[PDB]
């Protein structure tokens, strides 16, 4: 009569490493490293991204006529931009502080375009001016939908005031024209003056007349440089201009969120899928604590590591009796 104590073996081929031994066969084990590549761009936590199609963020915000207009109020968890957008800034100039703007608008609970300024209120001046460098299609001269180019000031001072009466901050974007020479300054404005001050809350931004030649870029030796600001709820902004100014006729009311995501740069389409964590090469829809897929990500993500594998033993040494 006999009784024996023993333990379970099976046909598993899994092995693990320990601090003391390498490649030890075990009866079961469990990976804690997410490794899978799927290449999908998904909704983040049930919330869809903003698809910029083939436009850059500044082109879409300012309303480049080749980019789709935001017709209804919306929201998004992140912004999806092509690596090299076909449609960007059409009238040459620099877009100021784009990196700071991304922090504000990459993850929004509300985003709605509204007309801010009635440009008919101004007299002795032309509005809705247009340029061949910003076409709606070949040979069809146009301009940014949201920005209104005012010409023929003749040194006259235009004055405007606005009060943000919503509970949402208001994003406005404007432009300032650096002409090439006195002659160009003349045909556009009719005077050798053209300066603008724009005040938002307690803050003053002054743009004196700058006449200076630059290299030709898409037909232009002049420049329109772009700037932006945020009018907080119950704050005002005002503008005083004698010329050389591209006015913020339309703006966006938006609702900030706490969680800053960013721009995902990729040529892929947005698929019908949902994930808790997104990268520009695919979704990491995993609650495993580590991932070796990509250094940059957004959402509720595992920590990025260099490991090729991280497998925990759960079962026994698989060393069956010979």
């Amino acid at each position: 009569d006999q009784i024996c104590i023993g333990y379970h073996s099976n046909n598993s081929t899994q092995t693990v490493n320990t601090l003391l031994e390498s490649n030890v066969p075990v009866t079961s084990s469990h990976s804690i490293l997410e490794k899978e590549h799927n290449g999908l761009l998904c909704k983040l936590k049930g919330k869809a991204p903003l698809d910029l199609i083939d436009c850059s963020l500044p082109a879409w915000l300012m309303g480049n006529p080749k980019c789709d207009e935001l017709l209804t109020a919306s929201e998004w968890a992140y912004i999806k931009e092509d690596p090299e957008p076909e449609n960007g800034i059409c009238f040459p100039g620099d877009f100021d502080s784009l990196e700071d703007l991304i922090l504000l608008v990459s993850n929004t609970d509300h985003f709605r375009k509204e007309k801010i300024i009635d440009m008919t209120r101004f007299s002795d001046v032309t509005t809705n001016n247009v340029d061949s460098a910003c076409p709606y299609d070949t040979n069809g001269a146009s301009f940014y939908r949201n920005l209104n180019w005012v010409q023929q000031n003749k040194g006259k001072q235009l004055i405007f005031h606005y009060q943000n009466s919503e509970n949402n901050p208001l994003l406005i974007i404007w432009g300032v024209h650096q002409t090439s020479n006195a002659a160009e300054q003349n045909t556009y404005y009719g005077s050798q003056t053209g300066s603008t001050t724009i005040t938002i809350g307690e803050e003053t931004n002054t743009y004196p007349l700058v006449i200076s030649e630059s290299s030709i870029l898409n037909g232009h030796s002049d420049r329109i440089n772009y700037f932006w600001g945020v009018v907080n709820p119950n704050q005002n902004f005002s503008i005083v201009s004698t010329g050389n100014f591209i006015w913020p006729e339309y703006g966006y009311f938006f609702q900030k969120t706490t969680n800053i995501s960013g721009i995902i740069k990729s040529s892929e389409k947005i698929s019908d899928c949902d994930t808790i964590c997104q990268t520009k090469i695919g979704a990491i829809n995993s609650t495993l604590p580590f991932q070796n897929i990509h250094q940059n990500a957004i959402g509720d993500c595992p920590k990025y590591v260099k490991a090729q594998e991280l497998v925990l033993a759960t079962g026994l040494r698989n060393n069956p009796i010979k």
């Binding site: 009784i3 333990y7 046909n11 490493n17 804690i32 800053i260 959402g299 990025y304 925990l312 010979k322």
Partner: protein, 170 residues
């Protein structure tokens, strides 16, 4: 036929740890259900802790600076290199240490079953040194069941065992 000292049992199909008995009525494998369930819960808890404690701040991909701020981009890049080296080293060693302990954990649970049977039988059996006990009296299914359930009565079988031990000491 032999026990844990020599390796595992492919024939133990319904648990992690257990017994194999042989008597006049038959023979077979049986799991210690309770020792198994306890171990499963412990290991499930360990794995779930290692996964679930990773409760993180919202992750951002906003890491861009202007073209005249490359020194700041480089600071941002070495910040990420720094955390990468921290998480990679700590994750690797954690797995290596936890695997060593998980294997020791299993050994300790098997040894416990062994010790429990051993102190029950005392000198009513001979420890064969291979994880098995040669018991010195007829042990029927009720007797085997008692050994497994921890209710074996050493004094009930003492007399019969002593007689067989005497025949052995010759």
């Amino acid at each position: 036929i032999a026990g844990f000292i020599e390796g595992g049992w492919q024939g133990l199909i319904d648990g992690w740890y257990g017994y194999h008995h042989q008597n006049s009525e038959g023979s077979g494998y049986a799991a210690d259900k309770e020792a198994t369930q306890k171990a499963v819960d412990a290991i499930t808890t360990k794995v779930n802790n290692i996964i679930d404690k990773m409760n993180t701040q919202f992750e951002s991909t906003a890491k861009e600076f202007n073209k005249i701020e490359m020194r700041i981009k480089h600071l941002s890049d070495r910040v990420d290199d720094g955390f990468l080296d921290v998480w990679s080293y700590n994750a690797e060693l954690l797995v290596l240490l936890e695997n060593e302990r998980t294997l020791d954990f299993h050994d300790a649970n098997v040894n416990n079953l062994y010790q429990k049977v051993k102190v029950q039988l005392k000198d009513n059996a001979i420890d064969m040194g291979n994880g098995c006990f040669k018991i010195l009296h007829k042990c029927n299914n009720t007797c085997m069941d008692d050994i497994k359930n921890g209710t074996y009565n050493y004094y009930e079988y003492r007399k019969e065992s002593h007689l067989e031990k005497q025949k052995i000491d010759s």
